[PDB]
Write a protein that binds this DNA or RNA. Sequence first.
DNA 1: CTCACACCTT
DNA 2: TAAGGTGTGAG
Lengths: 172, 177
Amino acid sequence: EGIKVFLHERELWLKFHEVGTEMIITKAGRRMFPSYKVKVTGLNPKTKYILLMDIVPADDHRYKFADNKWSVTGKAEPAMPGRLYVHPDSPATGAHWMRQLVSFQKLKLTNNHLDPFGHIILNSMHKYQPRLHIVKADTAFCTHVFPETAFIAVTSYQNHKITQLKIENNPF
Amino acid sequence: GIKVFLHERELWLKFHEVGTEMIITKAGRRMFPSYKVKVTGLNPKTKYILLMDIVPADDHRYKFADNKWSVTGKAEPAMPGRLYVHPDSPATGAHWMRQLVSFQKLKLTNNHLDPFGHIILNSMHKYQPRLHIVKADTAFCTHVFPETAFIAVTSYQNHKITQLKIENNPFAKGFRG
DNA sequence: CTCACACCTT
DNA sequence: TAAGGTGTGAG
Ligand SMILES: [Mg+2]
Ligand SMILES: [Mg+2]
């Protein structure tokens, strides 16, 4: 647990964070943008670990976007326990995980409470916090939370500034 | 370090074999056994926050029948679980390691409108208590003892749990044979 | 599922 | 002490 985790593309995340990050969620499931990726150090090279993500409510509010601003508009909806996204390389050695960027870019977000594909179910107009968890594969694990990756789940982009950012930052 | 050891593990296992139930009430109910741990491997001078939460063990709703728990439906959706921060937090590693860390005063309630800061559970659902350890100068670590999982109930279902509670909890001494 | 209650601990 | 944690058992 003397492990360090570093958010990749932090500057891009910050730009989105300043505006107020939104992530589109759909029936088919949508990848996050920015992608969530991390560098990890301090793992035992030979020990096996499972790396995984979840995405948990950031608060108890429900939100609306109006007058180019977000604001609380109600009580957050109750939900089922969040699904986990287990990194596909799991389980793997500390040396494997440390050798290059651990990317969670294939993680998908859906708004379909009946989703059959294992995608992470969110509710529109709620705020969420992505978390990374590191488990010795072998009762104990550690969790890393970057506040700048927090976001509001949306059904289509609300703040037109976000749309510009996404447009300006994806080659194709 | 960091290592966390469950106190009275033997007693927990006795309940766990039968299938642990924890009473929940409006006023808030202590767990029995008391959740207590020994911790080692902390930096003696560093300050830490210790806290617990209690999370759904699965997505099921249960029923008890034929002297057996069995799945009966989908679990009820719920709000995020409240935290119980240990009263001594924040404290130094040395403080935490000096004696058992007790979470005896943690209370469980069924009142979704509870104003007392107690942990809100739904009856007939299964739950897993977890201990978290947060350091000082984002990152924290979590310890999960599966032998402490339990089904929240409004009154005891399996009479073997009732008898265990009576035999081992001092406050129930008056009901003993 | 709830409450007044006897009986007990701390 | 006095305050407060138990399961009870009828409703
Ligand atoms: Mg990206
Ligand atoms: Mg104990």
